[PDB]
Design a protein around this nucleic acid. Structure first.
Lengths: 189, 138, 144, 143, 55, 101, 72
RNA sequence: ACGAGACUCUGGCAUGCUAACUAGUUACGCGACCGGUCGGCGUAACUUCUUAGAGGGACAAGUGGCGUUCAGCCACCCGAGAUUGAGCAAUAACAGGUCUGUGAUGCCCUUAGAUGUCCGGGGCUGCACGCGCGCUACACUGACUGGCUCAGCGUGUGCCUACCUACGCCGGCAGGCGCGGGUAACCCGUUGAACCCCAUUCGUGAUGGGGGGGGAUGCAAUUAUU
């Protein structure tokens, strides 16, 4: 009753967030099972924190004009490769999911500052919410653009992007875009 | 005369008439776990493993559904079932474990007792939809 | 625990109704399976070669659900959005000559009882056989 | 368990060695007279096993399909349903496909351009005949 | 003969002749409900019939 | 026969309420097997009108509502009583029709 | 810009699909067409024949998503 | 003082009251295997539903915090709702549009020589940056075929009105032979229209992915209106 779907145990889960868990709550009764409860939390400041990561990522991968509104296929496409990472890691996929997500958020961003100076902007740390949202959106963008006219098949590629980001190797779209952005910002300090 | 507090999600309304029975539940001439898309199967599964089968063994519930959309019918069927259970099991037997079960409901999902207020927004002229206006020629 | 026309996953219910009826052989097979296009919104042939049997199963199920389902109703079941080319796609029904052929099929096999004021109703014995195939599909996976 | 003899890398029917890599009955879309509904219905009614591999096709299948494209009346295709239905010059209901003259039969435009009819008097300069609004547009291929 | 000398031409889609009758123009006519009045007079006699605006 | 219907229609609410007051007064005069008023849904029509004849300025489609409201009453009563109740110089603006089907 | 697969009969008839695949932890028809440059027809036929042989565990099916693993 | 606001309507508001089988309303041996699904049938059930007239509810009053501790603001507990949308929308003016809504009105051919009265041919469908949201779709998220499961609350029979196929069939549409149940919640109806467990195919490529004669609304298919 107290575990996700009746299969994903939520009791012996990992801490894995030290204090970023205030943003993402999947370790108590605040963790719903299915990534679908309608988009009802996007109506006040910080209600996104209550929302589970799964639902947010399911909602996100539905864009680019070709995925405008159709969401049940998104839920199917995430449950697929959710099972893939689950059975490749053998344990609860939460650790690997969080590892992939937190390895993708750009550590710093070069925001344009100054009156009229565009030649030097400021490298500032990024907020955890903006970081995780941009990471999810950009990895979903990479997954989509690895699916049009590409020999890979969608609903299986995101599993490898997830496991690669969890490991951190540079083959993945999300972490490589994050690292190029990071190096651009380091030039800018 | 009667409460029959029903359940509404968006424009889709489902009402669960509950009376003394064996605990089995029917949704529109049909038991539960045979939904055609079978992607929101666990969504309809939610109440039974939320509150427990030991409370769903003494009440016959009949659900009637009407309203557009695949998902919109859901999120109201389960709400209707839950609120009918609250109503029937409150008006007769006891109030302490009533507080217990309604509290369990609230901590899992407040929507199961209270309905979603927000609905569609009317479209105004000069554009394709409600807020969006047409392209300005330049 | 009894049987019902829809208690099982209706997929296997209708599939096994069509298969049972084709192995039983009582229903006749149509003469043309290609000359008609089966739909205005469809510009190419079906891919079953027993789609008459499939449509008969579908209309039998839909008449079990709700009576009075006279002709002019099943034509909308397979009808849908018609790609009119550059024109916006509107709902167009299927070619109703095929629905008329299936109407010829139901009549004379005692499948349906008609009336002058419109509509048609399934035979109680017919629903007995429909509950028999329902029992077969139920005992396949859920009453075994 | 594959057939070990006669097997060719190129699926050959009409004596033009196109790439035989394509799976069965999907390579007949290039014929100027058989396509869309006709080609698809005559492969789907031919009782072909599309799950077969390239190296497991048999001479029986290619022979039977050759006969079926040779004979138009294998399953009583109607005349209004026929490909060259009530065409100009002569009325022929036989399914015959050969290069050199078939496209000339398709070239009934000789008469329409010679009698300089409305369509012909349009086509003298190369003006559109289906209402495509190209008042000044139409830059695809016109630089 | 007489049928070609005069009136050899009808108009069965006539909107100009069967236009909005009460005033002397063709435009501003919609064929629902029997309007036969321009939008300017449609508004000028709207509230008189019972028309109200709430949207 | 005991199958007589009356259909009243108007665009005003207080007019229909005073008509229902007339009917309840008649029912108070003598108790008869006359059923309650049938409140048809408030039937709305939308009409939308461009105002700038030539295109010059905004697309201000005047949105006018025609909301007709309908009340039914089916009566099984002697004719004289209901005729006296009804034919009492009814209010202008509310349209009443008596039907025998 | 160009990539070509093989639909011919070679070691792909038996090898790396009859005895080498069970060493994996997850099989996917797209992965088979990646490791061997094959088509969907071959993927479905090979999965069906191998399952009839009886060394494979089902997961689920879709028009483009049919999932299996090894169990023996 | 006008304007803003209040004000009106609108989804939240029958958790109680105004109460029609014609739309829906658990009770009522039959049909179904022998006790559990048919919307085809029966307490004329004294209306909770979607059918609505009254009445009610929410107010920054509750708490905490910030504020020059005033106006106020944020968070939290609650509640259907802690900002829903539109409606009405200044004084004054633009040298704006409309006489092409109008026989009052700036007007040389307006002495009834023609723009339609009477004809409709060629085209704003003719070609070059040439200003115009109008460009559905644009492919393995999806194109095929159908196993399939869901309110438009848009509305659809007209004083000199004539244009909305049940019951059976020939058919690719219409075509019909009596024949679209109704002046409408009666008749279209429980208006099975749209992402879906795919019901053969298309496992990475411009390809399966938008894609010249005819049988027939009106006086005439024409640069395929349809």
């Amino acid at each position: 009753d107290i575990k996700l779907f009746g299969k994903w145990s939520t009791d012996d889960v990992q801490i894995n967030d030290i204090s970023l868990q205030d943003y993402i709550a999947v370790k108590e009764k605040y963790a719903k099972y299915l990534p679908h409860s309608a988009g009802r939390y996007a109506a006040k400041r910080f209600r996104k924190a209550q929302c589970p990561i799964v639902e947010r990522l399911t909602n996100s991968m539905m864009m680019h004009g070709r995925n405008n509104g159709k969401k049940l296929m998104t839920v199917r496409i995430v449950k697929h490769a959710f099972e893939i990472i689950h059975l490749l890691t053998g344990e609860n996929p939460l650790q690997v999911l969080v590892n992939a997500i937190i390895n993708s958020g750009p550590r710093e961003d070069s925001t344009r500052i100054g009156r009229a100076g565009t030649v030097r902007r400021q490298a500032v740390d990024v907020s955890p919410l903006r970081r995780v949202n941009q990471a999810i959106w950009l990895l979903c963008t990479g997954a989509r653009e690895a699916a049009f006219r590409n020999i890979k098949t969608i609903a299986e590629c995101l599993a490898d992007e997830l496991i690669n980001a969890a490991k951190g190797s540079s083959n993945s779209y999300a972490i490589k875009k994050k690292d190029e952005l990071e190096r651009v910002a380091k030039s800018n300090r | 005369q009667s409460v029959q507090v029903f359940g509404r999600k968006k424009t889709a309304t489902a009402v669960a008439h509950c009376k003394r029975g064996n605990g089995l539940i029917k949704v529109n001439g049909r038991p539960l776990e045979m939904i055609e898309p079978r992607t929101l199967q666990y969504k309809l599964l939610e109440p039974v493993l939320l509150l427990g089968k030991e409370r769903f063994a003494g009440v016959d519930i009949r659900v009637r559904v009407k309203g557009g959309g695949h998902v919109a019918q859901i999120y109201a069927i389960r709400q209707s079932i839950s609120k009918a259970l609250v109503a029937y099991y409150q008006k007769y037997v006891d109030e302490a474990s009533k507080k217990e079960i309604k509290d369990i409901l609230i901590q899992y999902d407040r929507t199961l007792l209270v309905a979603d207020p927000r609905r569609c927004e009317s479209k105004k002229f000069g554009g394709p939809g409600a807020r969006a206006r047409y392209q300005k020629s330049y | 625990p009894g049987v019902t026309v829809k208690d099982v996953n209706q997929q296997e219910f209708v599939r096994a109704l069509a298969a049972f009826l084709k192995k039983s052989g009582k229903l006749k097979v149509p003469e043309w399976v290609d000359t008609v296009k089966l739909a205005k919104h469809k510009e190419l042939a079906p891919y079953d070669e027993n789609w008459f049997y499939t449509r008969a199963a579908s209309t039998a199920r839909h008449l079990y659900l709700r009576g009075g389902a006279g002709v002019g109703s099943m034509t909308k079941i397979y009808g849908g959005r018609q790609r009119n080319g550059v024109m916006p796609s509107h709902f167009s029904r299927g070619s109703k000559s095929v629905a008329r052929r299936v109407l010829q099929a139901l009549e004379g096999l005692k499948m349906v009882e008609k009336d002058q004021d419109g509509g048609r109703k399934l035979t109680p014995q017919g629903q007995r056989d429909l509950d028999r195939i329902a029992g077969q599909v139920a005992a396949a996976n859920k009453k075994h | 368990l594959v057939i070990p003899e006669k097997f060719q890398h190129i699926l050959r029917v009409l004596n033009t060695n196109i790439d035989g890599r394509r799976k069965i009955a999907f390579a007949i879309t290039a014929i100027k007279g058989v396509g869309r509904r006709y080609a698809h219905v005559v492969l789907r009614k031919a009782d072909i096993d599309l799950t077969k591999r390239a190296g497991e096709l048999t001479e029986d299948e290619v022979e039977r399909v050759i006969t079926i494209m040779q004979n138009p009346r294998q399953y009583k295709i109607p005349d209004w349903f026929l490909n060259r239905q009530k065409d100009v010059k002569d009325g022929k209901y036989s399914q015959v496909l050969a290069n050199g003259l078939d496209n000339k039969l398709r070239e009934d435009l000789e008469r329409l351009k010679k009698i300089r009819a409305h369509r012909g008097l349009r086509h003298f300069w190369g003006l559109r005949v289906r209402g495509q609004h190209t008042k000044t547009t139409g830059r695809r291929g016109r630089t | 003969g007489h049928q070609q000398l005069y009136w050899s031409h009808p108009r069965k889609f006539g909107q100009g002749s069967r236009s909005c009758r009460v005033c002397s123009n063709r435009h501003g006519l919609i064929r629902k409900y029997g309007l036969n009045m321009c939008r300017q007079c449609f508004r000028q006699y709207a509230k008189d019939i019972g028309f109200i605006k709430l949207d | 026969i005991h199958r007589i219907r009356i259909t009243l229609t108007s665009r005003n609410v207080k007019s229909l309420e005073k008509v229902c007051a007339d009917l309840i007064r008649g029912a108070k005069e003598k108790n008869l097997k006359v059923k309650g008023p049938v409140r048809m849904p408030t039937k709305t029509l939308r009409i939308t009108t461009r105002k700038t004849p030539c295109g010059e300025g905004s697309k201000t489609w005047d949105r006018f509502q025609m909301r007709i409201h309908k009340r039914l009453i089916d009566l099984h009563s002697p004719s004289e009583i209901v005729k006296q109740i009804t034919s009492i110089s009814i209010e202008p603006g509310v349209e009443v029709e008596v039907t025998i089907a | 810009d160009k990539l070509n697969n093989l639909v011919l009969f070679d070691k792909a008839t038996y090898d790396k699909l009859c005895k080498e695949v069970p060493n994996y932890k997850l099989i996917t028809p797209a992965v088979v067409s990646e490791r061997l440059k094959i088509r969907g027809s071959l993927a479905r036929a090979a999965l069906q024949e191998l399952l009839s042989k009886g060394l494979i565990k089902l997961v689920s099916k879709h028009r483009a998503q049919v999932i299996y693993t090894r169990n023996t």
